[PDB]
Amino acid sequence: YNDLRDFLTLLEQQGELKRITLPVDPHLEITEIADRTLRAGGPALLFENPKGYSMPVLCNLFGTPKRVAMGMGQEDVSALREVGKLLAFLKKQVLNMPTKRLRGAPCQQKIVSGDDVDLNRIPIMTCWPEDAAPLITWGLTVTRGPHKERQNLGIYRQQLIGKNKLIMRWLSHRGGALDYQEWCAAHPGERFPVSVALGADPATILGAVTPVPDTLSEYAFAGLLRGTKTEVVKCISNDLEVPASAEIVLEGYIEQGETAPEGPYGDHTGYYNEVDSFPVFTVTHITQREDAIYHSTYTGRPPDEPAVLGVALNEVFVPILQKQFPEIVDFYLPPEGCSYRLAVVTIKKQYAGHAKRVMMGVWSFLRQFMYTKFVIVCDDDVNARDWNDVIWAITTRMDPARDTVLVENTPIDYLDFASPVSGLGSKMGLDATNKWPGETQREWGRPIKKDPDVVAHIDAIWDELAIFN
Amino acid sequence: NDLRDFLTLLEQQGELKRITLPVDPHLEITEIADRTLRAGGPALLFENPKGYSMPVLCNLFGTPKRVAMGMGQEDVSALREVGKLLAFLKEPMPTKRLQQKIVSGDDVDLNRIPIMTCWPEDAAPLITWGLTVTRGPHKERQNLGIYRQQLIGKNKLIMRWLSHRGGALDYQEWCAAHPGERFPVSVALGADPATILGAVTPVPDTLSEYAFAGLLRGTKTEVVKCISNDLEVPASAEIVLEGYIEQGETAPEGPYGDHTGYYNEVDSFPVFTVTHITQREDAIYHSTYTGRPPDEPAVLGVALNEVFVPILQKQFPEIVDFYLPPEGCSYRLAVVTIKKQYAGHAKRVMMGVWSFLRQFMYTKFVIVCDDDVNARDWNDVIWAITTRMDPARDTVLVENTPIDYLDFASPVSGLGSKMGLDATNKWPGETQREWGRPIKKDPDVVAHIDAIWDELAIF
Ligand SMILES: Cc1cc2c3c(c1C)C(C)(C)C[C@@H](S(=O)(=O)O)N3c1c([nH]c(=O)[nH]c1=O)N2C[C@H](O)[C@H](O)[C@H](O)COP(=O)(O)O
Ligand SMILES: Cc1cc2c3c(c1C)C(C)(C)C[C@@H](S(=O)(=O)O)N3c1c([nH]c(=O)[nH]c1=O)N2C[C@H](O)[C@H](O)[C@H](O)COP(=O)(O)O
Ligand SMILES: [Mn+2]
Ligand SMILES: [Mn+2]
Ligand code: NA
Ligand code: NA
Numbered sequence: 049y050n051d052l053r054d055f056l057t058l059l060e061q062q063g064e065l066k067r068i069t070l071p072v073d074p075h076l077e078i079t080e081i082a083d084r085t086l087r088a089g090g091p092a093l094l095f096e097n098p099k100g101y102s103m104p105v106l107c108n109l110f111g112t113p114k115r116v117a118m119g120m121g122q123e124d125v126s127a128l129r130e131v132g133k134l135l136a137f138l139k140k141q142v143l144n145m146p147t148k149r150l151r152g153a154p155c156q157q158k159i160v161s162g163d164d165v166d167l168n169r170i171p172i173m174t175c176w177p178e179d180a181a182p183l184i185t186w187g188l189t190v191t192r193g194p195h196k197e198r199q200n201l202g203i204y205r206q207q208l209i210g211k212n213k214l215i216m217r218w219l220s221h222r223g224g225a226l227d228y229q230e231w232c233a234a235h236p237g238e239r240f241p242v243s244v245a246l247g248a249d250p251a252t253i254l255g256a257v258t259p260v261p262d263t264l265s266e267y268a269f270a271g272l273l274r275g276t277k278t279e280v281v282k283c284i285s286n287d288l289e290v291p292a293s294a295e296i297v298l299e300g301y302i303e304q305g306e307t308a309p310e311g312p313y314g315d316h317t318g319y320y321n322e323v324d325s326f327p328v329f330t331v332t333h334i335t336q337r338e339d340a341i342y343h344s345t346y347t348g349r350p351p352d353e354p355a356v357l358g359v360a361l362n363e364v365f366v367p368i369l370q371k372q373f374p375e376i377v378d379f380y381l382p383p384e385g386c387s388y389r390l391a392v393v394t395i396k397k398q399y400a401g402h403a404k405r406v407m408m409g410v411w412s413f414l415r416q417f418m419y420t421k422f423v424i425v426c427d428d429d430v431n432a433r434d435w436n437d438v439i440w441a442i443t444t445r446m447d448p449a450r451d452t453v454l455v456e457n458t459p460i461d462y463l464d465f466a467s468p469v470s471g472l473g474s475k476m477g478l479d480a481t482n483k484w485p486g487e488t489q490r491e492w493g494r495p496i497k498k499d500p501d502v503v504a505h506i507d508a509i510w511d512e513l514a515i516f517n
Numbered sequence: 518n519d520l521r522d523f524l525t526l527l528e529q530q531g532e533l534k535r536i537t538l539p540v541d542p543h544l545e546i547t548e549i550a551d552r553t554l555r556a557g558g559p560a561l562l563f564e565n566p567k568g569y570s571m572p573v574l575c576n577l578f579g580t581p582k583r584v585a586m587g588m589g590q591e592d593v594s595a596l597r598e599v600g601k602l603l604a605f606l607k608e609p610m611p612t613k614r615l616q617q618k619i620v621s622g623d624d625v626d627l628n629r630i631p632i633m634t635c636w637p638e639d640a641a642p643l644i645t646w647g648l649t650v651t652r653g654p655h656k657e658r659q660n661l662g663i664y665r666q667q668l669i670g671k672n673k674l675i676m677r678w679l680s681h682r683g684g685a686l687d688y689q690e691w692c693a694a695h696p697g698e699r700f701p702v703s704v705a706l707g708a709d710p711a712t713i714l715g716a717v718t719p720v721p722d723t724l725s726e727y728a729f730a731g732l733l734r735g736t737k738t739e740v741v742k743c744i745s746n747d748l749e750v751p752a753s754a755e756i757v758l759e760g761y762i763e764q765g766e767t768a769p770e771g772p773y774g775d776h777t778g779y780y781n782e783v784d785s786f787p788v789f790t791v792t793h794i795t796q797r798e799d800a801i802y803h804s805t806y807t808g809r810p811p812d813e814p815a816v817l818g819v820a821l822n823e824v825f826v827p828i829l830q831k832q833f834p835e836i837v838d839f840y841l842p843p844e845g846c847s848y849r850l851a852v853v854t855i856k857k858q859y860a861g862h863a864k865r866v867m868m869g870v871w872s873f874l875r876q877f878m879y880t881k882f883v884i885v886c887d888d889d890v891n892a893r894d895w896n897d898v899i900w901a902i903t904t905r906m907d908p909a910r911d912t913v914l915v916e917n918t919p920i921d922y923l924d925f926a927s928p929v930s931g932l933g934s935k936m937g938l939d940a941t942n943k944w945p946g947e948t949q950r951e952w953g954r955p956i957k958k959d960p961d962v963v964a965h966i967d968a969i970w971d972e973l974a975i976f
Contacts, residue, residue: 401918408869411868456913457910
């Protein structure tokens with residue numbers, strides 16, 4: 049049973065984890081370093097010498113698809129396709145696979161409570177210059193509602209506002225938020241217990257961010273990814289269970305009606321979002337391991353680690369698109385398109401006008417892609433994940449006015465300020481497929497194909513040629 | 518059980534008329550059937566076709582009722598439950614093989630059968646209710662489809678399957694996997710209604726239309742091995758034609774009047790060579806015609822839309838109703854009513870219609886409305902269009918989309934545009950005006966007048 053440290057050791061063995069011994073500030077500096085590293089496809093980062101703290105800071109954990117896959121015990125990303133197929137069937141009784149509860153766990157080696165609680169001792173990162181305060185970004189928030197037993201895990205950003213106070217920024221459709229809302233109705237004025245785990249094992253982390261239905265515990269999903277039940281421990285001050293191997297656990301509650309102005313904070317869109325009110329999480333206990341490590345990240349102008357995560361987790365929907373449109377070879381939402389705003393789709397085209405049906409399919413078939421503003425459709429000789437192929441296709445297979453489709457007055461994310469009216473805007477599709485007779489009267493270009501015999505011969509003498517050494 | 522049992526049921530209920538007067542299969546039957554269909558009349562059995570001894574049955578499914586009866590049910594609204602069944606599709610019933618008596622060889626002569634000529638400029642007599650049975654080389658599934666078949670000789674028919682059909686794909690794959698070998702084919706005329714309906718229902722290519730007929734019937738489809746090949750045809754069929762397609766043999770087909778109300782121009786299709794004809798003793802010939810709608814195929818197509826509504830609703834639960842008027846050539850215009858939940862919703866629904874199911878890929882007009890509209894009444898639909906739309910704001914046009922190659926109205930063969938009319942109530946963001954509150958009646962007044970209606974005695 050691999051905890052997070054076992055994963056960091058695996059990564060280090062494979063040249064996927066760099067230990068930084070230089071002093072680095074959690075205020076802004078770590079983010080800068082992580083950002084350059086992620087943008088160059090570099091390793092995960094463990095800052096052993098954060099300025100002003102003793103607890104090392106881990107970030108960029110999942111900055112690469114490979115490391116996401118490794119985090120689920122795999123070579124590559126396509127086990128997520130199988131999850132997609134699973135989650136489909138429900139709309140398999142031993143997917144009610146529970147947690148395995150230990151009594152006593154490494155995450156409760158050191159315990160501090162009441163007035164000794166001081167979040168300022170933890171190297172919480174400040175990500176961007178106009179961010180309001182340090183921000184906890186990789187907390188697994190654990191909650192129960194009053195009506196079912198299911199424990200939800202979500203990642204909700206948490207602003208520091210005091211020695212023992214965080215703001216809990218769950219958006220209103222989240223498990224945590226719905227649990228709190230129901231607790232309030234069902235028990236007026238009673239405190240809502242909540243717990244937050246930092247640095248759990250990778251399967252739990254990945255399970256938290258898999259979009260499983262509200263009816264199911266994310267702990268059960270982590271179990272399927274791992275191959276074994278998730279190891280947990282009861283919290284000290286409530287009946288919630290947190291992962292046993294967690295590096296740090298925050299326990300506490302939400303006082304009903306206590307709220308605070310949250311932000312502004314830079315988000316995955318690359319802009320600051322404006323101040324808004326969210327509940328206050330009061331921290332009564334902090335439990336941690338000996339030699340605890342603090343797991344953090346940042347969100348900002350993409351790509352960032354959440355966006356790389358989000359790409360790997362989109363594999364969950366590709367098979368559902370392919371059941372419906374088997375012509376679709378690949379379907380990719382670049383991180384640098386804020387994760388959902390641009391799609392590149394490659395097809396085996398079968399008739400004139402095919403690309404238009406596919407665009408309309410993307411914009412209608414699933415709710416996950418209904419708000420996608422740009423859709424580029426290409427043939428299967430294009431790698432959707434390489435802008436060198438996609439731009440090549442766009443610039444050699446399109447006449448812009450002929451091959452661009454615009455639809456006005458369509459549903460758009462209310463937070464997208466670039467549309468003319470909140471909730472309503474246009475969409476564009478680019479048909480960059482080879483044009484067939486009927487679509488063009490010209491003699492279409494024959495692409496240059498290499499001689500496989502020459503390719504193989506050069507493979508054979510490549511090392512001996514010694515061009516590099 | 519078989520077709521004859523169905524005819525007897527219909528006759529008992531005043532839904533089948535026997536015509537004893539002499540009537541020519543050249544044009545006359547079509548005229549009689551067309552009038553009958555247009556007035557919602559019964560199915561028709563012509564016992565005295567001029568120049569033949571074999572009775573001619575047509576307008577079998579000329580009414581929605583008779584389509585329902587043909588699947589054992591009492592009502593057209595049972596077809597929704599069939600749709601719920603046709604849904605079962607994610608992941609993680611065979612034939613019963615056993616009659617038809619007499620048989621031919623070199624004295625195969627299709628001219629002895631009362632094949633109909635439907636319209637005055639049609640090229641030749643045409644077989645219109647043949648269940649064509651095929652296997653491909655790669656799977657075992659037997660496809661059943663209805664493909665019009667022109668008479669060109671004592672023993673030769675043209676096989677007009679369009680290129681996306683099961684039969685056509687099977688032949689195309691057979692050619693390629695077995696160059697120059699004959700493609701066995703069989704056509705059954707007058708099978709039991711469930712099999713017939715199963716054949717026209719668009720089930721996925723992966724599934725034998727025999728399996729689906731089994732679900733409609735409640736029991737496995739009874740079938741028999743053909744004499745000259747390994748295909749199986751329904752045991753109760755009135756006539757069976759067996760033979761093959763010689764690779765590369767093609768003939769000019771048509772012109773023929775179509776379900777669009779126009780003549781298709783001449784075009785080339787494979788030749789089906791008939792080596793055997795098998796039939797029952799007092800065989801009945803099942804035929805129909807297509808033309809300007811409504812016709813029997815269009816009535817079929819309306820009943821089979823009820824099957825699709827649930828499949829559309831599973832995917833788009835905002836859809837309350839979904840209707841393809843027969844007058845739109847059955848597939849070219851759709852009216853969809855929704856419970857609108859956000860600004861711009863209609864657009865998602867239009868794109869869904871144009872992308873979700875293949876039968877609607879060529880639908881050139883889509884009108885979307887709110888749920889206070891009855892999609893089946895032009896009075897409501899036009900009222901919605903003319904009171905809830907600004908044409909330029911609320912009309913969506915998409916160019917260069919797939920279109921039926923026979924649709925001569927598109928600017929280029931196979932490619933044309935589509936139009937969606939958003940006739941929903943416009944929400945803030947879509948309009949800055951004060952939207953109209955519709956006039957609702959007082960249900961107390963309505964009920965009070967219902968109560969004194971008879972006493973008022975206006976009629
Ligand atoms: C992986 C991740 C995810 C999330 C977040 C972040 C990360 C790293 C951080 C903390 C960096 C930043 C924000 S942000 O992406 O919204 O900019 N954060 C976040 C937030 N969901 C949310 O409601 N508030 C949040 O604050 N999300 C999404 C959320 O956790 C996710 O959608 C879960 O699947 C929700 O689980 P449920 O509540 O549906 O069970
Ligand atoms: C009920 C019916 C249907 C059909 C047809 C006819 C009838 C009575 C007739 C022979 C009267 C008229 C033509 S027509 O509507 O295209 O003019 N006919 C027909 C044709 N499908 C086809 O490819 N060629 C055809 O010739 N169709 C449609 C096709 O049979 C039907 O859509 C099947 O579900 C398709 O079979 P699969 O390939 O899906 O297995
Ligand atoms: Mn959840
Ligand atoms: Mn079929
Ligand atoms: Na979750
Ligand atoms: Na069929």
